[PDB]
Amino acid sequence: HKLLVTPPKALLKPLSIPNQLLLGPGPSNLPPRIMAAGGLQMIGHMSKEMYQIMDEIKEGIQYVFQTRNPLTLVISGSGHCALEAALVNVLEPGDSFLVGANGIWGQRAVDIGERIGARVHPMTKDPGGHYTLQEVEEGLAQHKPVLLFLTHGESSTGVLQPLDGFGELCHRYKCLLLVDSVASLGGTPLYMDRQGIDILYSGSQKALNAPPGTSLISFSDKAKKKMYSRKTKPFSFYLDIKWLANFWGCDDQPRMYHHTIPVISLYSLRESLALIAEQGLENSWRQHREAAAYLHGRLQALGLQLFVKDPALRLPTVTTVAVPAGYDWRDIVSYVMDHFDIEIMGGLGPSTGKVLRIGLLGCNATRENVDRVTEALRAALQHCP
Amino acid sequence: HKLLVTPPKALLKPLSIPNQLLLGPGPSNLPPRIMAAGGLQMIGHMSKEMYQIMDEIKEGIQYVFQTRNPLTLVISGSGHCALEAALVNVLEPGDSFLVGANGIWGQRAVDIGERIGARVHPMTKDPGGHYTLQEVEEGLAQHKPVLLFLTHGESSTGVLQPLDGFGELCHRYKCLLLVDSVASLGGTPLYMDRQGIDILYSGSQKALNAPPGTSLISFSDKAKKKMYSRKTKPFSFYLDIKWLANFWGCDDQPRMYHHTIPVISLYSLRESLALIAEQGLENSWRQHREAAAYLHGRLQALGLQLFVKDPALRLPTVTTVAVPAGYDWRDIVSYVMDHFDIEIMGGLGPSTGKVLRIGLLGCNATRENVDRVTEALRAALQHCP
Numbered sequence: 001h002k003l004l005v006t007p008p009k010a011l012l013k014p015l016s017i018p019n020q021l022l023l024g025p026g027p028s029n030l031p032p033r034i035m036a037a038g039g040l041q042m043i044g045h046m047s048k049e050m051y052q053i054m055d056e057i058k059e060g061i062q063y064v065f066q067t068r069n070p071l072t073l074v075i076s077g078s079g080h081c082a083l084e085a086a087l088v089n090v091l092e093p094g095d096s097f098l099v100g101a102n103g104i105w106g107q108r109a110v111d112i113g114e115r116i117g118a119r120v121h122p123m124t125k126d127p128g129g130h131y132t133l134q135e136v137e138e139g140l141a142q143h144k145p146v147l148l149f150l151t152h153g154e155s156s157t158g159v160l161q162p163l164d165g166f167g168e169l170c171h172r173y174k175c176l177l178l179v180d181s182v183a184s185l186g187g188t189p190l191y192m193d194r195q196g197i198d199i200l201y202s203g204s205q206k207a208l209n210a211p212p213g214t215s216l217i218s219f220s221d222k223a224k225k226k227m228y229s230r231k232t233k234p235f236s237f238y239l240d241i242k243w244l245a246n247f248w249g250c251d252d253q254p255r256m257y258h259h260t261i262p263v264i265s266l267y268s269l270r271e272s273l274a275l276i277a278e279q280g281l282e283n284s285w286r287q288h289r290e291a292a293a294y295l296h297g298r299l300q301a302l303g304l305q306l307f308v309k310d311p312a313l314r315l316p317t318v319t320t321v322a323v324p325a326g327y328d329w330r331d332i333v334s335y336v337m338d339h340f341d342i343e344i345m346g347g348l349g350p351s352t353g354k355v356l357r358i359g360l361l362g363c364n365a366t367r368e369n370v371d372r373v374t375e376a377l378r379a380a381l382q383h384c385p
Numbered sequence: 386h387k388l389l390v391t392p393p394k395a396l397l398k399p400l401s402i403p404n405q406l407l408l409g410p411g412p413s414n415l416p417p418r419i420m421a422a423g424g425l426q427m428i429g430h431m432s433k434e435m436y437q438i439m440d441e442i443k444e445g446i447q448y449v450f451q452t453r454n455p456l457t458l459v460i461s462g463s464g465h466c467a468l469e470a471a472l473v474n475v476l477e478p479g480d481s482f483l484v485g486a487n488g489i490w491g492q493r494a495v496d497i498g499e500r501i502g503a504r505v506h507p508m509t510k511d512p513g514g515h516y517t518l519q520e521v522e523e524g525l526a527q528h529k530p531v532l533l534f535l536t537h538g539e540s541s542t543g544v545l546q547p548l549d550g551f552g553e554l555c556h557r558y559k560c561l562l563l564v565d566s567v568a569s570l571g572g573t574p575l576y577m578d579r580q581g582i583d584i585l586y587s588g589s590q591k592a593l594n595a596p597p598g599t600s601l602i603s604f605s606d607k608a609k610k611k612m613y614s615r616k617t618k619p620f621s622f623y624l625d626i627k628w629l630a631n632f633w634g635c636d637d638q639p640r641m642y643h644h645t646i647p648v649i650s651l652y653s654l655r656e657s658l659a660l661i662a663e664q665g666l667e668n669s670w671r672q673h674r675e676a677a678a679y680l681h682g683r684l685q686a687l688g689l690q691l692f693v694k695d696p697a698l699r700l701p702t703v704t705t706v707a708v709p710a711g712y713d714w715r716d717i718v719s720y721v722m723d724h725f726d727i728e729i730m731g732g733l734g735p736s737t738g739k740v741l742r743i744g745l746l747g748c749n750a751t752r753e754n755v756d757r758v759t760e761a762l763r764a765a766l767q768h769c770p
C-alpha cells in the first residue's frame with residue numbers, strides 16, 4: 001500500500017530555461033508566431049476543425065514541395081521517422097535499394113535499409129562528395145534497384161547536391177527517387193514534380209523554424225502504386241502509409257482513427273507554413289543564398305577555411321568550416337556558448353572532429369546572426385588555447 | 386524556372402481555433418501551466434540544460450510509474466509508438482507473444498506483433514471482459530510465451546483490469562509482463578515494481594493533460610537483459626532502444642545523437658509531471674475515483690445505463706455508457722458538440738456503435754464537467770430524435 005518513489009524535488013521547482021542563440025544545424029530559434037500557437041489550447045484530435053487545419057497543412061506541404069501529389073502528409077515524428085516511414089513502406093524485404101552514402105544521412109538510410117531486410121548498395125563517397133550524375137547512372141544501372149536515396153542538403157558535410165534529371169533518369173530505369181530535403185527545404189531551390197522526385201521528405205525544425213518532432217512527406221503516384229500493391233506488410237504499424245494516408249484525407253474513405261496526431265505541434269507547423277507562404281519560396285531561397293554568401297565572406301576573413309571547396313556545392317542552410325589547426329575544436333564550441341550564449345556545432349558521423357557547422361535557418365538566416373557568430377568565433381580564436 | 390503551386394490562400398488567414406470542452410477519452414484540455422511552457426523558446430537539443438530537463442522528466446516517469454528501473458525514458462511518439470517500441474525491441478521474429486485482446490488496444494498489440502513476425506496468441510474476450518487470473522495462468526502455461534501484453538485501463542471498453550500477481554506469476558514462467566497504462570496512469574493505482582511489471586508504457590495526452598505526441602516507457606532489468614542480448618536487430622532504427630537508452634542517459638556511455646527530441650513537447654511533459662508530483666499520486670487517484678463515481682450517479686439518473694456491470698471494474702478515467710435504444714448515437718454526440726461545445730466520443734474497435742465514452746482526465750476530472758456533460762446529455766436526450 002506504500003509508495004516506493006517520492007515526488008522528485010527537481011520537479012517542484014519551476015521550469016526555467018536559458019536564453020540561447022541557436023546557430024547550429026538545427027533545431028533553430030522560433031519566431032513569435034510559432035511560439036504563440038505553441039501556447040494554444042487543445043481541440044479534438046478528430047474535430048472537423050482539426051481536419052481543416054490538417055488540410056491547410058497539406059496544401060502548405062504541397063506549396064513548399066511544389067507538388068500536387070495527393071499522397072502528401074505529416075509524419076508524427078522527427079526527420080528520421082519520415083525517412084524510416086519512406087523506407088518501411090517502399091522496401092519489401094528483398095527489394096534492391098541504392099544509397100548515396102555522402103554523409104551521415106546516407107548512412108542512416110543504409111542502417112534502416114539493412115534493418116528492414118533490403119539489398120542496400122552503399123555508394124560510399126568521402127565527406128564532401130556530391131554524387132556525379134555520372135556515378136549515379138552507373139550505380140543504378142549496375143544494381144537495378146527499385147529505390148534510390150539521395151540527400152539534397154547534406155547537413156553533415158555542408159554539401160548541396162544537384163538533383164536535376166535524376167528523376168527523369170530513375171524513371172527510365174523504372175526506379176523511384178527518394179530525396180532527403182530536411183536541411184534544404186525552404187533554403188535552396190527544389191521542385192518535387194518538375195524534378196520528378198518520387199518520395200520527398202523534410203523535417204519541421206530546420207528552415208521552417210517549427211519545433212522538432214514532426215516531419216513532412218509526399219509520394220508520387222508511382223510510389224503510391226508500389227506501396228498499395230506490396231505483398232508484404234510493413235514492419236511498422238505506426239508508420240503504415242495505408243493507415244496514415246486515410247486519416248490524413250488522402251483516400252476515398254472517411255478518416256479512421258489510427259494514432260493521435262500531435263495537435264499542438266500541428267498548430268505550430270501550420271503557422272510555419274503560413275509564414276513561408278507569405279514570404280514566398282523564391283524570396284526565402286534568396287535570403288538563404290545572400291546570408292550564406294555573407295557568412296562565407298566573414299569566415300574567410302577570420303583566417304578560417306570553408307570545408308567545401310566549390311561554392312556552387314555549398315549548402316546555404318548549413319555551413320561547414322574546417323577546424324583551425326592548433327585548436328581543440330571543442331573549446332571553440334564551448335567558448336562560443338560560454339561567452340556569447342550562442343550554439344554552434346561540430347562534426348557528425350564522417351565529418352566528426354574534422355569540421356564546425358554553422359546553420360542559417362528561416363527567420364534566423366540573417367546578416368546580424370552572421371555578425372554575432374563571426375564576432376563570437378573571432379574572440380574564441382583569440383583566447384581558445 | 387516557374388512555380389507550379391501558388392501559396393495557399395487558407396494559409397494566408399490567421400490561425401483560429403474553436404473553444405471546446407474535451408470530455409472524451411483524450412486528448413484532454415490543457416491547464417495554464419502546460420499551455421505556457423508550450424509557448425516557450427527553443428534551447429539546444431543537446432545543451433546541458435536540455436539534458437537536465439530530460440533527467441527531471443526521467444525522475445518524473447519513475448515517480449508516476451513507481452519504479453527505479455534505470456531504463457526509463459520518453460518515446461518521441463504517440464501512445465502507439467511506445468507500444469510499438471516495446472514490441473519491436475522485445476520480440477524477435479519467432480518469439481512467442483500472448484495478448485489479452487480485451488479491446489482495440491489488445492488488437493493493435495496483435496497487429497504490431499504479427500507485423501514484426503511473432504507467434505502471437507489472441508486471448509479474445511468480448512468488449513467488457515477483464516481477463517481472469519484464471520484465464521491467464523492457463524493461456525501462458527499453454528503457449529510458453531516470452532511476452533504477455535495486458536491493457537490496464539481499457540479506454541475502448543471502459544474496463545479497469547486487475548494487475549496484482551500477474552507479475553509474480555509471469556516471472557515464475559520466465560515470462561516478462563507488458564502493461565499499457567496510457568489511460569490508467571495518474572487516474573487509478575499502479576505500481577510498476579511492486580507489481581513486478583516488466584514493460585510499462587503510458588502516453589502524454591490522457592490523465593497527465595500534456596499535448597499528444599510523446600509517450601512514457603520503462604523496462605525492468607529482465608527486459609533490459611532480453612533486449613541487449615537479442616540476436617536479431619529491431620526492424621526499426623527510430624525506436625531502437627539501444628540508441629534511445631544512450632541518448633536518454635541510461636548508459637555508461639556519453640549521449641550520442643540519435644534523433645532530435647521534441648524539445649518543446651518535453652517542456653510541456655516536464656510540467657505535467659511537475660503538476661502530478663505536487664498534487665501527489667494518491668490524491669490524484671482519489672480525485673479520479675470520486676469524479677467517476679459522481680459521473681456514474683448522474684448518468685444512471687438520466688435513465689442511462691453504465692456499460693460495465695461491475696463497478697470495481699470501471700475505469701475511472703474513461704466511462705462507457707450503453708447506447709440509449711431508439712437513438713442514433715451519432716446525433717447525441719453531434720448535439721453535445723453542436724449545442725454545448727463539448728466533445729464526447731463513441732465506440733472504438735469492438736465497442737463501435739455499442740457505446741458512448743466519457744473521459745475524466747487530470748485537471749479535467751471535476752464535478753463541474755460531470756455537471757456540464759450531464760446537463761448536455763440530458764438536453765440531447767430531450768430533442769435528439
Ligand SMILES: *Cc1c(COP(=O)(O)O)cnc(C)c1O
Nearest residue numbers: 078079080155182183203644645
Ligand atoms: C536535421 C536533419 C534531419 C532530421 O533529423 P531528426 O533529428 O530526425 O529530425 C534529417 N536529415 C537531414 C539531412 C538533416 O539535416
Ligand SMILES: *Cc1c(COP(=O)(O)O)cnc(C)c1O
Nearest residue numbers: 259260463464465540567568588
Ligand atoms: C489514448 C490511449 C493510447 C494512446 O494512443 P495514441 O493515440 O497512440 O496516443 C494507448 N492506449 C490506450 C489504452 C489509450 O486509451
